Amino acid sequence: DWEIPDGQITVGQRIGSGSFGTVYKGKWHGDVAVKMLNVTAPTPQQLQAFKNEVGVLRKTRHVNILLFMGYSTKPQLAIVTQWCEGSSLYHHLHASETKFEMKKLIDIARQTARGMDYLHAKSIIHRDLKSNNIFLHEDNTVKIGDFGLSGSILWMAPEVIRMQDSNPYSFQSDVYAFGIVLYELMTGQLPYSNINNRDQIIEMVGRGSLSPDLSKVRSNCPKRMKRLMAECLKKKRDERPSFPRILAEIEELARE
């Protein structure tokens, strides 16, 4: 069991709110992160969210997935993970001075492909893959999570934006989102940055008129990565590849 008794965890600095609950830095046999429902009387929806989140985190033991360590129910609903030193891939690419060699951009893509390949193998659909949810622990190891701290529409597949079918999230919607991460790495830019109304992107991507401008990839982006990227961004859901095939293509091409 992964339930942590009461009176063991210390809660330190409040980092931010996210998904459901607030994240804190904390102390429990070393540094930890603590996501805590800051509500006196939880609703059933809140309780169920917490159980669903623990339910999935429990199933993960992989170096590229944020390390779940346990949970607590009293005094508040709380999920405990490893603390990560550094900042998100989003921060490095679009909020900072930082410079990546093409070797490291390929490696980030590969570590991300491993973690996503692992999740999909255990029937877990992320639903919100994006560079802000890819953490660079010690600026060296990718850690996938849902860190919380609008936003997500750039990584939304057409079918997801449209919302035609009850809950449109699929392995392939995750694949599309990974495609958009590859765009970020190989261009250094968020897609649709030439278009200035958020409402148009939503209409045009869902309509199928707008997709990322693949001309803006770098001169030294390998040609196979470019082809892959475009295989992931296919507008029809079922033309997209699977992560075993994606992982194999990025590990083949990174050998060279």
Place this chain on the structure above:
Amino acid sequence: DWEIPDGQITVGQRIGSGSFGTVYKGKWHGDVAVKMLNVTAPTPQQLQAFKNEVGVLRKTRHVNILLFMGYSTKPQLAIVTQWCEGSSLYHHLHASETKFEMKKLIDIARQTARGMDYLHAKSIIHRDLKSNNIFLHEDNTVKIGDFGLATEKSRWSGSHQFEQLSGSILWMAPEVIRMQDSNPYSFQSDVYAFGIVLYELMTGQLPYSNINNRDQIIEMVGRGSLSPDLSKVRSNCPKRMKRLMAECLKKKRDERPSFPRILAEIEELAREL
């Protein structure tokens, strides 16, 4: 459940075998290590060891403990973990040119104290803590395990008692060397072993290196005449680390501190600077 179906794991280069199986580099959703029992006809003792090892690894989720990922039963008994890039603390200190600043030696000791404090909180006794079992993943994060490769061969054809002699004896507490108790391993035997790791970090040397009769070390440590020479600690070893070291190396089992107290001391020690 953490059972991995057959025909998913790929086994690559053989890293080393010892008494509890053979470790390989492997592929399963990325790099992994694979400990595989390379025995034609396992005994009940061997089968039970495998179940006990999985049993305890299953209970661990902590950044300073080697990450268990799963196990397989067919075609062979196998435990799967994260692959670690780098080399053991033993390699860096006694088999290498590497130089650690005192900041990093204190940090290695602290990360090791966190992992051990975590294990003891879940009632897990390591039994074989030593610098060869403390891995420096990416030369930055301590990962405690039992890596312990005794030969480089496809299996270990010695006794466990030879294996311990070639390695483990320096980190054995007096009570453990004697074997006067029925099963002499305790939280405190682990504490003694951590004491000897602190000696390694703060001296850069294995203890008793001014002696070569391995048989004498066994008699004299167990007899209580010989303990590590604390004079050989560095000029810039903080005085509180030295005092802690000696509290861990107490010859009487129950005079030794507990890991909550050890960790609290090392985090205060590190606070200063």
